[PDB]
Design a protein around this ligand. Sequence first.
Ligand SMILES: *C/C=N/c1c(NC[C@H](O)[C@H](O)[C@H](O)CO)[nH]c(=O)[nH]c1=O
Lengths: 96, 264, 189, 231
Amino acid sequence: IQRTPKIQVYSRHPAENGKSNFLNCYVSGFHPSDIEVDLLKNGERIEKVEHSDLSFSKDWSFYLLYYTEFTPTEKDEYACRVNHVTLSQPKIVKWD
Amino acid sequence: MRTHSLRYFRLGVSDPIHGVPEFISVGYVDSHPITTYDSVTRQKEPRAPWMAENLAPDHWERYTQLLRGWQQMFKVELKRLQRHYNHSGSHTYQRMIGCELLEDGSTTGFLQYAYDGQDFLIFNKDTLSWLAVDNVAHTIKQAWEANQHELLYQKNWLEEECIAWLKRFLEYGKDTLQRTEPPLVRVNRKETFPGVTALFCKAHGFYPPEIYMTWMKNGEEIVQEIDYGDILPSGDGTYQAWASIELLYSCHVEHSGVHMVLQV
Amino acid sequence: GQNIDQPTEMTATEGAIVQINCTYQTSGFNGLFWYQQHAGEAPTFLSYNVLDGLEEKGRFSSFLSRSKGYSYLLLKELQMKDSASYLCAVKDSNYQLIWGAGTKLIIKPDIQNPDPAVYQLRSVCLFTDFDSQTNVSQSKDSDVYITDKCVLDMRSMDFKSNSAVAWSNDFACANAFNNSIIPEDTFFP
Amino acid sequence: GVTQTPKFQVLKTGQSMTLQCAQDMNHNSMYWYRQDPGMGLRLIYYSASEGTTDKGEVPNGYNVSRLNKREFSLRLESAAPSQTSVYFCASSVWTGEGSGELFFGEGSRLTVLEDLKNVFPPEVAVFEPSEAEISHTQKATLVCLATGFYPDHVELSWWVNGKEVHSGVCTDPQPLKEQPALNDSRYALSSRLRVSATFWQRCQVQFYGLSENDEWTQDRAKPVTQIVSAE
Ligand SMILES: *C/C=N/c1c(NC[C@H](O)[C@H](O)[C@H](O)CO)[nH]c(=O)[nH]c1=O
């Protein structure tokens, strides 16, 4: 039994254009443990991205938090790109 | 005092694909990582600054050696489990041990194993027995239950040792672990699909992550469909969560002994 | 881990009972062990205790009280073969074994027919067949050598006897064991 | 289960030495302890599993090698007199498990001397039972004396009509010091053998001393490992 990751993309604080914030991508509930996460700005990979270590849940699945400091603009598009053994191709999850 | 827990996990992977370590063991106090060890570093390292400054190198040096042995034991146990099932390729083996100090002062302790992310063996410290999920788990259970003294050592670890460590670590990390950051809560009203009005009760900036959010209609519980957002980490040590309904309504939020009502 | 205290030595009579205490003051507790170590031999595991109670293994029982940080090793129907050292060890919070300095156990035999006598051998003076309550004192001279009290067993005749040896380079069997508190009725041929 | 070597060893200060320890019980954890009078066993080094080792309580002057799962050797690089002791190798199934007991090796007695000039085998003499003991108790005690040996590395045993005996035998647990005020005093060991007057109507001492490898520049015969007996 393999479990595909749950992928959630959200800001640290309620978002307001022009005000500095942090973009979060929480990847959870997956099994096995090998995963690849990237944060994107207009389809391109953000290089200065911080992350927690692989974490363990009591249901034997894993979770991680990926985040980067950003200033949201009406024209800038943000996403979280995730790859796991359950996925044929990496999944691009847009920030709402 | 609020409820607190101490847990340690072990993760073993056979035939690891390039990058994934063969063995990882992580310690937690509530939702905070406190220690880590893996087959690549072969070192026990703190994952919290208050762990680093309160535990001397003697602790870190002693447990590195024990974890080196626990790593080897996990390697062999997973080979034996794969032989029992007739399994080839990469398989996973997991352990979770821990205890809880409840608000009323009572305690819980648990010790569990998983094979391929599914329940495999569950310890019952009150009867000193192992609960097996299938015949392969039953074979292992018979072996573990043959050693009565290891069963008593395990009961003593869960009920006494684990609790004494938890209380020690609660004192070290008190400025983070025993603090309280009240939630910022707002209710947002919006007409969605024509004729439908959605109410969103959103909370953020709270610590600890334990929160209660509920929607009430005319003072009594709602019987309609409520959507719930996950309690998500914000990245700054605080959390966020939400609850929504459709259409006198009020959102009720309880967090660390404080009740909050938001009347629409 | 910090301190483990057990008596240095204990003396009891054959067929009787002895209790060896062990008190520990440690940082955490993961079990308490008892090991038996015969003279000039390797220690051998006797018992393990981690929860409160008493466990029996033949004539040997081990007790533990976690709250009092105390254990005892009890031996019943004391036999001569029980003369050995008894080691108490505790595993602390870090699974480090803390050892106690050991308890030497001396078993006084059951002298049914005491016949105290000092003989001369072809020289050496042998003080034999005395009662277990007799304590042999050491020499004070540079040339006189007195040995410690020894118990020998003739299993075929179910006979046990106490003995001490003396020798020097002037030296008489009458003055040999004069340092000790010799029984009044000691035979001097 | 646990096999350690050597049983006895005489070393000159500065000399190097290696104690061997093997176990065929598939144990993962191995330990080196020293036993000294009046104190608890002190861990020198330990190996929690194959591929790792760490310092115990008294690691200075020693080093270890976990060669494989079965073997854990202890090395004395430059022997010092403070290293005079009884060395024990032990093994357990694992470490970091409360109930697992230790399985001990037979022990290694090590004596470190500034020089080997005071090393002597014993003089072994048997004393015939007195006529008085035979006519009073109808029992006969044969006494054996091993005298002037150094260091204290001896195993006294009795042998009657070609076979070793254990019944009616008592050997002193610790030998006495012939020159008690002297730091390098030589030793004396006694033992008794009791038989019936009808049975009376040979003692042997195994000495552990020098080896073929040791240099001897003295007039007296090299004090090597030997057996000294009395009939
Ligand atoms: C400092 C890290 N400790 C640790 C532990 N320790 C808890 C117990 O001593 C251990 O689970 C025993 O095996 C319980 O019988 N456990 C762990 O899995 N990983 C660690 O880093």
